[PDB]
Write a protein that binds this ligand. Sequence first.
Ligand SMILES: OC[C@H]1O[C@H](O[C@H]2[C@H](O)[C@@H](O)[C@@H](O)O[C@@H]2CO)[C@H](O)[C@@H](O)[C@@H]1O
Length: 451
Amino acid sequence: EEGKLVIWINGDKGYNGLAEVGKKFEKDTGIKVTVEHPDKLEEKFPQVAATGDGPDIIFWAHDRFGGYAQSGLLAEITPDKAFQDKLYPFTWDAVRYNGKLIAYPIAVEALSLIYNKDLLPNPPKTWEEIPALDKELKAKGKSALMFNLQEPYFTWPLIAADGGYAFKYENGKYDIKDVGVDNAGAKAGLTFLVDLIKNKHMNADTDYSIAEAAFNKGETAMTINGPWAWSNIDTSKVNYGVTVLPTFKGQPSKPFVGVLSAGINAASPNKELAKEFLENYLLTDEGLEAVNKDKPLGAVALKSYEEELAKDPRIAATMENAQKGEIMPNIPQMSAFWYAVRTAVINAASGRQTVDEALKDAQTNSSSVPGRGSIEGRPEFAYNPDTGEINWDCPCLGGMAHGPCGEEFKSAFSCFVYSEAEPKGIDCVEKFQHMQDCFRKYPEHYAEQLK
Ligand SMILES: OC[C@H]1O[C@H](O[C@H]2[C@H](O)[C@@H](O)[C@@H](O)O[C@@H]2CO)[C@H](O)[C@@H](O)[C@@H]1O
């Protein structure tokens, strides 16, 4: 465990090409480096991290790192002043959580509209002309676009285009009370997506694989994917191009911009070797190229690499989108935001719910939830995860189970303590709300609302 490195990275990125860096390391350090690509590792990491085996180093987009940093799951990083100049200021900004760097930035990624020349020589400038493009081209399975409708990352650029946003960026810090998924604009974005599924232009259950496989084969004129896709489309031998995303209601489409980042685990026996690896083998030109060859990272964080590769019109298109869109927050609430919007988009797309109804929930689930203080922490001792029983008389509950709002507290607590959702308890929002709403009838009783 102490003798070697086990790195984690998502299935879509170039893990073999990283394995090539790992072997290059092994050679002149005598330190084996294993690359693994599990499923749902962004969620898997905080599980195993505190509960035994986690990896030495973890790759993900920066948005999740603030959460892990808050949970104390990451070693603070120590790249000297000299090394910091090798990478763009703004990429460093993406991995700072409360004035301390928490990961290395690798590459900056935003998804783009992917042409299909030979099918569509002149890509649609706007969104709203899509329905009249799929209808101009249909007699086989001659469809115009197929993108992942299972992940909110892909649907979001639409929802954001006309005024949708996650957390408002006000006064140099993101305000977790200002959520824009309920607004006129988001509501419009989603109505369109729903009107594509309604008018049979898309299928509500289109996976990443379903979308890629259908495009690669040559069925769809367009897809929406990021830089890690290109590599499989070269293989496809499909005459493709990469460009600005269509403009919904005239306003630009706004992709949430990801910065691939590499965190060292707070519980990594080998924290000194991890630095060596990342700083001195990966974040080198010969290092980043090894990966990039395998699955294109996008635009990299390395200055000394980037400008000699800004000619490449796909990178330039990626970057155009990146600048139209907005950089993701790293703050812990992001975990919840994604949950909120994933449920919301999917619940709409299936008719399960109306746009209004859906995004109504989305807004509340994204928002801060009161009475957490009464539930998280010491009170959780009342729950022994072996039997699954709860002692409602545990003094750790601070008497809360009995009293005018006892029944309500029991609802919220048990909910959160049983919650298997990610993030923990995100499914218990209504009940926490109800419980706080109850506390209000008896304010002389519950100074649980002193802030
Ligand atoms: O859609 C929710 C999901 O979006 C982002 O994850 C991206 C990631 O940034 C990409 O590099 C690539 O792996 O695709 C993912 C979406 O399938 C967020 O960064 C992530 O936190 C969030 O759950």
